[PDB]
Amino acid sequence: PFRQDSILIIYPRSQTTLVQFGLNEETFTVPELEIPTQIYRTTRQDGSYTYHSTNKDNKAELIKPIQNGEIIDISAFTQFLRLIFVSILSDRANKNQDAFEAELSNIPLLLITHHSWSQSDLEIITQYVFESLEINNLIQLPASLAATYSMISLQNCCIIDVGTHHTDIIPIVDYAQLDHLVSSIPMGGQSINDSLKKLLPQWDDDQIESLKKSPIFEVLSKNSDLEFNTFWDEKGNEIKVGKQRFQGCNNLIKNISNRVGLTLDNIDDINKAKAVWENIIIVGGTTSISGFKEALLGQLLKDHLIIEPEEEKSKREEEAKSFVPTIEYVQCPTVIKLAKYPDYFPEWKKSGYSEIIFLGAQIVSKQIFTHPKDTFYITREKYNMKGPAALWDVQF
Amino acid sequence: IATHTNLERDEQKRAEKKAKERLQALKLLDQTKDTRITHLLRQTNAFLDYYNVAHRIKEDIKKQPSILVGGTLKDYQIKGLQWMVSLFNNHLNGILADEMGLGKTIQTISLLTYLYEMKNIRGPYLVIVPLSTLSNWSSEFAKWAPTLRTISFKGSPNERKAKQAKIRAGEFDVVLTTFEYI
Amino acid sequence: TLNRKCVVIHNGSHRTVAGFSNVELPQCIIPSSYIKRTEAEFIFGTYNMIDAAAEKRNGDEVYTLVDSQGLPYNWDALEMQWRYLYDTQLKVSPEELPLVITMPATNGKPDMAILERYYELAFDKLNVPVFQIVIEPLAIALSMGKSSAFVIDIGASGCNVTPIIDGIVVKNAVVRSKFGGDFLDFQVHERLAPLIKEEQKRSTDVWYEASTWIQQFKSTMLQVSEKDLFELERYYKEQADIYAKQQENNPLVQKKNFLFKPLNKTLTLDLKECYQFAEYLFKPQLISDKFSPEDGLGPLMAKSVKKAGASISPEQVYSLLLTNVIITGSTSLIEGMEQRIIKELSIRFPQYKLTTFANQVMMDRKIQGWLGALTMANLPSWSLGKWYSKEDYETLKRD
Amino acid sequence: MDPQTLITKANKKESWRYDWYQPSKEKYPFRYKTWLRNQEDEEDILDLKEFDRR
């Protein structure tokens, strides 16, 4: 144990699910498999359910198991995992045919979880992985920790994970996710869309979405020099736009910031707190919008930095006209910083770090699965003894 | 963190081998002058004519520190005094290349007494000398200035047990020790 | 160990802590209060309330769940809170798992009436399978490897002093001070009032301010002086005169700076004014002329030990208690607090040697009550605690 | 091949249920759900490449 060919990482999210089977060994590659997170559920007279990849003869209903990051249908969710897992087996079993003795003989699974999943959901998933998929080794890695492990392993930090309809805020102290501080706001990328609809009434949804995803949309805090600029439709249609391309991100940025502030203010050990504020981690699709992260930082500074009020400072400098020492405050944060990205994953640098949580998982899985110690995953041994409850003896 | 460091080292080697071939194929020591002057900036700001850029923080005073008592003031330990103080303000080390008889003891006494006559920190600070002259250095720490205590180390382990057993909590201005006792 | 997983709930008078017995920290710490926003409607949770509070909307009002006894007094609201916890935080039917909850030490009287209201809530309403009730000072002490201990809990409602001898709680020596965290909030506010402009029904703003800047101020400005402050002052003065006179620094003149966000304004206190707030916990006769020095924490601790010596030698109980002093509670984390509680105890009992114990980890004392219940829930035998079942209720219901 | 048999041939043994349990000292009066071990007696495929990015 274990073959690197064999490591399987799954990262399921509301819209899609990133998947990878086998680690490259030279450098880590950005996940190439992206499967929409949904399954079809046919209902068979007599009550029971059947699950397919396609609307079978238009008889099945379309189930979207994960919504706003939460599992809303645990059965369709497990069926969706099986569907992924089986597909991978078939694919490899064709290509190579000796696969069941090699690449498919011992498949350890790392499943990236979301803060919102029940213990009940996590146990059921564990049961499913050991009983239905007949897999033997499982790590359930929280998304937040994947984040901090990718980010050159930070003991103290805050994860701001911007989704489409919600943003999660998750403080990590001493490599532990602080559950009672964790929260999400019902606000994300779509907010930008919505802000823009108000600013550009005569546009439609696809036009607005296209602007957001275009080279000329940025958050300010040379394109910025031009009054108007140009970009092209999804359907090739050229669209011109004024100052609106520097708008629409503000309401979201303010909401996130207000939340970050209330959160970090409830970290009880001020020495931990100082560290967290100095390692803000921002992740998610939205964050690839040029200027966004820096704009968000800018706002956290504007709202939360402990520093002398400018008027007060200006008086003191007039007074000294007749050198001014720095006023020291008892509060934190006096320093706010974004955590430093690792620049030595070439493939990741190339594609941006909106999905860096996955790199977290590539690193953890290699660590854990290419070393003897079985301290951080459930094994068959353990499953046989405690069952799904085995899960809680290997939490991080 | 350590894993990361190794991933980073490996990448750096990989990239370096790549660039090295790429740059030489299709498809004298004054680097120490300018580079070690910018490196002087590296010590000054980044660590904390060479007569100027290295000495950039300037000062001179021909008056002794007020703690020095019972001594005559000549010209040499002035220029040497604020010379080493010039090494102090810039956060720089140094070596004294002088002949002999110029009073290294004087420059250390007036050094600490002037510097931390200003800042008042005055400790903990370490001085180490040959056992051949030890109580001497304490004798110039006696008549040439009071108010800065001294921790010596001599003799059997018992006297030491008294000394670092009393000062075990680490309160003192200066420790005067010798070679093998570190 | 046992094949079970419990829900552990602690309803303090200020904070409510909830989570499962299988992990080291609680899933949630939320306020033991709620906003009633008006068709009525009930808001629970730290961010939900702070958001709603900042909206500054009329008709919004904060109400509490736990009285100063540390006991629930609004049981219709308590159910809504429990529902909220089970639905949105633990996310599990209350019918599945055993429940472990806390009560504060009492003199014994309110006990039966409470137990009944819990039956009604746990059984009639929620359909909980079975529950245990642990006594907070007792569990905290056990969680700390101690069977006998003098447990000094400084929370929001005041100080709660509880001697515990050989696993048993001495009820007549149970003592609850009236001055603690919430009191400190009031004083910080009244004192700073003129620098911040400011100088029930207005519960919403009182609450929001207590939960925001006032909370930060307490954690960063206040300190407890080691020795009676009036004496410290006379001394520091008497010394200061001599340094001055002698030639031709009084520590109380150090300044402390707090950035007050709502007005982007610096508030500076000298160290004395910082020491002053907690002095009230020790000498409450310094606010009103209506408080005796005996309502102060020092006399109170003493009172409770002496009432322990009356069991049912004294200079033995005294010796037991004083070698197992436990200091606990959110407010006990204010810098200087342990030492003053100790100095205050040591001088009322000079013949004895005090040894005190305290969780030094910031988080863990704020929730040490919940931590205590947690370590009860992980006890290896079902016989280690009284576990009330639907039965017990049935049988009490008879005549 | 048959997905179920693919699952069966890879990675080469108990089963648990989540059910009512009633502890004993004989038996305590109460129940609670837990993960109990069972006694002796107790669809499709998708094509990657569509989902591969290109």
Ligand SMILES: Nc1ncnc2c1ncn2[C@@H]1O[C@H](COP(=O)(O)OP(=O)(O)O)[C@@H](O)[C@H]1O
């Ligand atoms: N201004 C002075 N007046 C009198 N004696 C001096 C003066 N400056 C130095 N000395 C003599 O120099 C000696 C100290 O020099 P020392 O510290 O041994 O120099 P180095 O360490 O460079 O050999 C003392 O014994 C002292 O008598």
Ligand code: BEF
């Ligand atoms: F002053 Be020299 F070191 F004899």
Ligand SMILES: [Mg+2]
């Ligand atoms: Mg010499």
